[PDB]
Design a protein around this ligand. Structure first.
Ligand SMILES: C[C@]12CC[C@@H]3c4ccc(O)cc4CC[C@H]3[C@@H]1CC[C@@H]2O
Lengths: 12, 225
């Protein structure tokens, strides 16, 4: 239920 | 490990940029004011995630804790920023450099006036206390970290508290004035939390009755409720 937030957290 | 002074400087270097938004050409309506404010919020959320990742220790927490903290604190962190932007402008909310709302302009959105009045009153308290820039930085970090890997987190929060105590000591006031200033700053955390709770109820309702559509990251945060 957090695909975007996780992706922002993991993005560099 | 960082000194208090170094931690504060790290928070200073992590500050997110001011998102730019402009008034629509046509007079504000309930729908268009809600559209401008949610569009602002969604863009700020992107930069907020990047800010959190630069707070020392945050990315060492479990990815589950990172999600939970941001999920709980985001509205508070947005409001704290707004209040800082607005601190030297009584009667006004400086959402962005070209979106400066006078208190009465909230009359066009059902229910928002109450929340504008909370944000304005808390902003006035910070003005009267003469909140300093470095104090603001520590408080905002404390909002994120207290919003609630576990050993790491209480440690992180303690480091930021030590940093705030260090900033207050540098002001040179007496030992009892230092304790008094710490208490008065931290007692305002509950007013920020209160305003967030009310803002969240308001936005969730507006979304629910389809007054305003929300997208992407802001949508995802709201769907969590
Ligand atoms: C959440 C609301 C929309 C987004 C608004 C916003 C948007 C951006 C920002 O930096 C701060 C705030 C605080 C007030 C918020 C509003 C209070 C009620 C409204 O639903």
């Amino acid at each position: 239920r957090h695909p975007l937030l996780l992706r922002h957290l993991l993005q560099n | 490990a960082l000194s208090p002074e170094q931690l504060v400087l790290t928070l200073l270097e992590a500050e997110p940029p001011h998102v730019l938004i402009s008034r629509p050409s046509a007079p504000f309506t309930e729908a268009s004011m809600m559209m401008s404010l949610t569009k602002l919020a969604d863009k700020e959320l992107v930069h907020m995630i990047s800010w959190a990742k630069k707070i020392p220790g945050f990315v060492e927490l479990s990815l589950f804790d990172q999600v939970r903290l941001l999920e709980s604190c985001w509205m508070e962190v947005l409001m704290m920023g707004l209040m800082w932007r607005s601190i030297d402008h009584p009667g006004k909310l400086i959402f962005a450099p070209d979106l400066v709302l006078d208190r009465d302009e909230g009359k066009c959105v059902e229910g928002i006036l109450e929340i504008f009045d909370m944000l304005l009153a808390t902003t006035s308290r910070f003005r009267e206390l003469k909140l300093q820039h470095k104090e603001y930085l520590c408080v905002k970090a404390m909002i994120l970290l207290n919003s609630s890997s576990s050993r790491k987190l209480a440690h992180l929060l303690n480091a930021v508290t030590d940093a705030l105590v260090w900033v207050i000591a540098k002001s040179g006031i007496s030992s009892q004035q230092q304790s008094m200033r710490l208490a008065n700053l931290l007692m305002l955390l509950s007013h920020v939390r209160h305003a967030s709770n009310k803002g969240m109820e308001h936005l969730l309702n507006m979304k629910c009755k389809n007054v305003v559509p929300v997208y992407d990251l802001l949508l995802e945060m709201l769907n969590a409720h």
